[PDB]
Design an enzyme around this catalytic site. Structure first.
Site, PDB file in Angstrom:
ATOM      1  N   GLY C 294       5.501  -4.724   8.733  1.00 53.70           N
ATOM      2  CA  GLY C 294       5.355  -3.950  10.132  1.00 53.70           C
ATOM      3  C   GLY C 294       5.250  -4.705  11.234  1.00 53.70           C
ATOM      4  N   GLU C 346      10.076  -4.254  -1.719  1.00 50.10           N
ATOM      5  CA  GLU C 346      11.723  -3.915  -1.404  1.00 50.10           C
ATOM      6  C   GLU C 346      11.970  -2.930  -2.794  1.00 50.10           C
ATOM      7  OE1 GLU C 346      12.353  -7.892  -1.420  1.00 50.10           O
ATOM      8  OE2 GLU C 346      11.862  -8.069   0.722  1.00 50.10           O
TER       9      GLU C 346
END
Ligand code: MG
Ligand code: MG
Ligand code: MG
Ligand code: MG
Lengths: 362, 362, 362, 362
Positions: C294, C346
Site C-alpha cells: 500500500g 500475489e
C-alpha cells in the site's frame, strides 16, 4: 472538408431524390432549406434524418421568426446542425446555444446582413458558436479572406460554388462547402459529387505531404544544431555504464523502446524500465530519461532514484532547466517547436537516436 | 575509430610511465614496439597487460624471424593483437592465424614491403586476417586510398601522424590510427591524446548528422511518391470500420502503437494486437498490418484470421506483392532504397502515420 | 544441496581418473585431500582445476601448520574453496578470510576438535566464514543437529556417508555432503554418484510439494476470512462504474492484467494502466489499485489522480491503513502470514480475483 | 441472483409507488402484472420503463389471447422481458421468439398448467427460450427440483416467497426470485428488499469461497501427482541453458512473465518472448513453452524454431501428446480438470512455478 448539399427546392420528393444520389457520391451534410420548412413542417428534417441516419442534417432556419423554440423544434426532429442569422439579437443566440447544449446540436450563424462581418465573427466565437456561414458574392471571396483569418472555429461558405469555383474557396481556408444548383440541377448529381470529393482529396494529399515535410524540416534543424557536449556526453555515458536503463513517458516511451531494441543488437547490457526483465538499478548504471517537458512525474522519480543509487542520468528533453534537466549529468536538448510540440519532440528523438546507432556501428 | 600508441622506446620504465598518461587521455591500444621486445623480453607485453587490463596491448613482432612460436608467446604473455609482416609466407600467416584463433586474439599484418599492395590486402582478407596496416609515406596517402577501397576489415595507418596529418587519414577511411612520437615525445602526452580523440569526434559529429539527414531525405522521397489510391484506401477503411486493430512486428510494432495512441485521442475504437485489453475480431473490424517484408509469420497469420472473420485488412509494407500484400484489401507501399532496410521502413512509416493523424485532425 | 567428493588418495593419477567418473555422475565439488597435498605439491590443486573448470576444487588444508601463506597458495593454484580447522587462532582465520576475499574464494572451517561446537560455529559466522564442516561420528549426528540450528550459512557434513546414511544427514539440514570411499573405492564410482544425486532429488520433490501446499494453505485461510463488506464493496463499485482501470505494481500488475482479461470477456469497459490503449480517467470511472504494501509510489500517485477526477478507488492491499488504503473508498484486505511476503499476496489475490470472476459469471 | 417484484395491484399509482421503493432497496426487475395490463394499456410498461430505465421491466402476458403481436407490442413499449404460457401452441412460442430476436428482448415461459413440466422444459430450451417460470406450490418445491436439474437456462420461481422461504428456493438453484405481497404489502417495502438482497450476498460469499477452494483443491492434486522426470527435466534444462526464453499464450503468458520475473532475481539469463529486450535464440538456449492445449499456433511456431536452432524445449501443457508435447524434450503435464479448464491450468502452473522458485532458493 465537408460537403453540404443545399436542398432549396420546394418539392419534397425532388429533394429526397437528390439527397439519395448525393449521399452515394460522398456528400456529408444535407441541408433542408427554408423553402422546404415553410410548406412542410419540421418533419421535413425528420424525414431526411430517418432516411439518412448516417448523414448530418442541417436545418435552415435563417428567417426572423426564429427563436429558441424553433431551434429546439429542429433538434427534437433530428437536426444535427441548425443555421440562424447573425443580425438577430444576442439574447436569441445564447438561448439557441443553451438549447443546442441540451441536445448536442451544432449552431451555424450567417453574416448575410451584417455591417462589419469581421468584428461580428469574433464575439460569436466567444459565446460558443460552432460554425460561421459567409457568402462568396459570385469583390468575390473578399469576405472569406477576413472572417477566416479572424476566427478559429470552422467557417462555412456558399454562393455559386461549382467545379470551377470550389478550388478557390478551399485555398482560402473554408471548412464547409455548401453547394446547391451545381449538384441539384445536373444530369448526374452523384457524379458531380464525386468530382467535388476528388477536389477534397487533392487538398488532403497536400496536407499529408506538407505534414511529413514539416516534420523532416524540423529534424534537419535538430541535426544541424546538435552539440558535441550532448552527443559525446550520451555516448561516453553509454560506453562507461554497467547496465543501461531507458525510461520514457507515453509516446516517448515507445521511442525509448525502439532505441533499446537496437542497442541490444550491439551487445549492450540494456533494459527498458517497466518491462518484466528490468533488474535493479545499481551503482555505475545509466538511466536515459526521455521527457519532452522535463516534468513528467514518473520520469523525474526514476531519475531521482538513479542518482541516489550512485548512477548517471542522461535527460533527453526540450527544457534543459526543467526538474529532470537539473538532475541529469548530461542534457540533450531536443526542440519541440502542423504537428504538436510533442510529436516534433518524439519524432526528432526517434531519428536522433537512430543517428546514435549509426555512429556506434562505425 | 581506434587510437594506437606506438611505444618504440627501449626503456621499459619510460614506456609504462608514458602509456599511463596516454591511457588517461583516452587512448585505446598500446603497442610494445620491437626495440622493446628485443632489449626487454616478452615480459614487456605482460607488464603492460597487467597494468592496463581495460586496454588492448599490441605486441609488435614485425620482423621476419617471427614464426608461430613467437606469435604464441605473445598471446600467452597477454597480447591482445599481434602485428606481423605481409611479405612473409602464407603458411606462417595461417599458422599465426590458427594460433591466434586458439586464444581469441586478433592479427595485424603490415604491407610495408609488398609489391602490389592492393592485391595482397584482399587475399589477406580471404585467410581471415583481422586488420591491415599500411604506411602514410610522409605519393603520400595513395596506398591508404586503395587499401581502404579494397577490403572490408579495418585498416590501420602509421607514418608521421600528428595533429595536422591525422584529419586526412581519417577522411580516407582509416580505422586504426597509430601515433608515436607525437604523443610519446611531447611535453604533455595526455593532453595530445585528448586532442587526438577530439579529432575523432569531429568525424563522429559528421557521421551522426549525415545519418539523420539520410533518413529524412528518404522520407521526403516517400512523401513525394505517395499514391492517392493507397492513402485514401487506408483512411476510408479506418473511417468505415467498427473496431481498428493495429499489429506490427518488432520495431514496426512500436510504430503501430505510436499511431494507435494518437487514434485513441481521435475517438476511434482502436486496439493493439498482443496487449491485454485487445478484444475479439468481428465482422466489420479493420486490421492494419505493418510489416516491411510482408512475410512475417505472425502478421500473416493475423491477416488470415481477419479475412475469415469478414473483416478488412490494410497492409503497410515495402513489398506490395508479398504474402501479406496479396491478402490485403488495401496496400500502402512504403518504398525502400547508411541506414539499414528495416530502419528506413520503420522511420518512414512512423512519419507517414503522423501525416495521416495531421490529416484526420483537419 | 552440494555433493563433495573427498579424494584422500595419495596417487594423483588415480585421483583424476576417479574424479572424472564422479564428475560425469553429477558431483559438484572435488576435494584434494591432505595426503595428496603432502606427497604431491600444491600442483595437485592446479591439475584438478584445469581438468574440471566447471567444477569447484576444494583444497584440503586441515592441518595446524596452515597459515595465510598456504591458504594464499591454494587460491593462486586454482582452489575455489579452502578448508581449515576451527581450533586455530582467530588471527589466522581472518588472515585466511582476508586472503580469500582478495581472490573471491570461499573458506570452510572444521570443528573436529572444538570443545563447544555450538558456540564456536556462531562466532565463526560473525567473522564471515562461509561454510562450517562437522563430522557425523559414525551420539552420532548430535553435532549436526545443533550446528544446523545455530547458524544460517551452509553446513558441511562428513563421516561414514554412504547410500544408507546420507538420507539422514539431509533430513537434519546439511547442505554440503562429503563422500569419500563410498564413491572412490567402489566398482562403479559414476553410478554411485548418480544414486547420491537421486537421493538429493528425493528431498527436492518434498521441497516443491511442500512449497506449493504452503501457498494453497494460506489462500484457504484468505478465503475463510474474506469479509462481506470488502467483497461487496468491490463488486458494487465494479458494476456501477463507467470505465474500470486496473493498476498493479510489478508482479501484482501481472495479476491485475490476468483479472482484466477475464473482465473484458464479461463485457466490462475495462482498461489496464500503463498499456497503449488506456484512455483518460473521467468522472464515474473506477481505479482498482493492487499493492501489497500500500505504499508503491506510482500506485499511490494514480489513486490520487483518480480521486481528483471524481472517481472511485478500490485498493487491494495487505495493509488497510497504508497510504493507498487511506485514499481508497473500498479496501479489500488480503491477509499476510517458505514463501515470501510478496509471493503469498500475489498468489492469494490471483485466486481471489478468480473467485470474483466465478461469482460474476453466475 | 435476480429479484423480480411482481406488481399484481390494479392501482397504477400504488404500483409505481412500490417499484420506486423496491428500486432503492436493490430490486433488479419490475413486473407489470396482468391486472395492470387489462385496465391500463400497453403504456403501463412504458410508464414503468421511462421511470426506471436502469431496471428491466417484465411484461406479464400470461393469458390465452396473447399472440406474436402482443409480444411485439410489449417490446415497442419498453418491455425487456415478456412472460407467456407453456400450454400455448409451439407456433406462437417460436413466433414470439422471432419477434424477441428483432428487438433483443428475453422470453419467459410459465408451466402453470403443463402436465409433464419436466419434459416440456427441455424442448423449450431447444427453440431458444431464455427463462423458465415455475411455481413453488406453497409437495412444495418438488417442481423446482426436477425442472432445474433438467435444463441449463435460468429458471424463475414464484409463489409465497418471503424472508422465510426465499433461502430454500436459492438452495435448489433458482436464478430469478419473483416476490409479490411480501414486499408490496409491508410497512417498509424498501427495507424488506434489502433483506432479500442480503440473502443473495449470503449465497455470493459461499460462491466465491467455494470457487477459491475448488482451485486450491485442484492445485494440491497437481502437487501430489508431480513426477520426478518432469520437475528434474525442467530444472536440469534451466541450469544447463545459456539463455532462457519463456513464451505463453494469453493468460498463460502472464503466468510465464510472473515466473520470469522471479528467475531474474536468481541471476538467471532469462528473457520473455515478445518484449523489447528479447535477444536472438541461439544454440544451447532453452525455450519454456506454456500452452494448456498444446496446439496454440504461435507457441508451436516458437518451439519449432527453437529446435531448428539447436536448442531445448520444455512444454508445460495439459496434453502430453499434443503438437507442442511431441516437439518438447521435457513435457510437464499440468491437468486442467466451478472454474474453466484454462483457469485451472493457468493457476496450477502459477503455483507450480512458484514451487520451482522455492526449490532453486534452497
Ligand atoms: Mg443554405
Ligand atoms: Mg607501427
Ligand atoms: Mg573431509
Ligand atoms: Mg407473475
Amino acid at each position: 472538408m465537408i460537403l453540404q448539399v443545399a436542398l432549396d427546392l420546394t418539392d419534397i420528393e425532388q429533394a429526397i431524390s437528390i439527397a439519395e444520389k448525393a449521399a452515394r457520391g460522398g456528400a456529408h451534410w444535407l441541408e433542408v432549406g427554408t423553402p422546404l420548412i415553410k410548406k412542410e413542417g419540421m418533419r421535413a428534417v425528420e424525414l431526411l434524418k430517418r432516411r439518412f441516419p448516417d448523414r448530418k442534417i442541417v436545418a435552415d432556419l435563417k428567417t426572423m421568426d426564429t427563436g429558441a423554440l424553433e431551434v429546439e423544434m429542429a433538434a427534437r426532429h433530428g437536426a444535427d446542425v441548425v443555421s440562424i442569422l447573425g443580425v438577430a439579437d444576442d439574447k436569441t443566440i445564447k438561448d439557441a446555444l443553451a438549447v443546442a447544449r441540451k441536445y448536442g446540436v451544432k449552431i451555424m450563424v450567417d453574416l448575410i446582413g451584417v455591417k462589419d462581418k469581421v468584428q461580428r465573427a469574433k464575439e460569436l466565437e466567444q459565446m460558443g458558436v460552432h460554425y460561421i456561414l459567409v457568402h462568396t458574392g459570385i469583390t468575390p471571396l473578399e469576405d472569406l479572406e477576413k472572417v477566416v483569418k479572424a476566427v478559429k472555429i470552422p467557417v462555412a461558405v456558399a454562393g455559386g460554388l461549382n467545379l470551377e469555383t470550389i478550388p478557390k474557396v478551399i485555398e482560402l481556408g473554408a471548412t464547409i462547402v455548401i453547394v446547391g444548383s451545381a449538384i441539384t440541377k445536373s444530369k448526374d448529381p452523384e457524379g458531380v459529387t464525386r468530382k467535388i470529393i476528388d477536389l477534397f482529396w487533392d487538398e488532403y494529399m497536400k496536407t499529408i505531404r506538407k505534414a511529413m515535410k514539416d516534420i523532416t524540416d524540423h529534424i534537419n534543424e535538430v541535426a544541424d544544431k546538435l552539440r558535441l557536449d550532448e552527443v559525446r556526453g550520451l555516448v561516453d555515458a553509454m560506453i562507461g555504464a554497467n547496465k543501461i536503463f531507458i525510461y520514457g513517458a507515453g509516446r516517448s516511451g515507445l521511442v525509448g523502446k525502439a532505441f533499446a531494441m537496437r542497442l541490444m543488437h550491439l551487445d549492450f547490457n540494456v533494459y527498458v524500465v517497466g518491462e518484466t526483465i528490468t533488474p535493479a538499478f545499481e551503482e555505475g548504471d545509466l538511466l536515459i530519461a526521455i521527457s519532452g517537458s522535463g516534468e513528467t512525474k514518473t520520469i523525474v522519480d526514476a531519475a531521482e532514484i538513479a542518482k541516489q543509487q550512485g548512477g548517471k542520468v542522461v535527460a533527453i528533453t526540450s527544457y534543459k532547466d526543467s526538474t529532470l534537466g537539473r538532475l541529469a549529468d548530461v542534457v540533450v536538448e531536443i526542440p519541440g517547436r502542423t504537428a504538436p510540440m510533442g510529436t516534433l519532440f518524439e519524432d526528432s528523438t526517434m531519428i536522433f537516436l537512430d543517428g546514435i546507432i549509426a555512429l556506434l556501428m562505425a
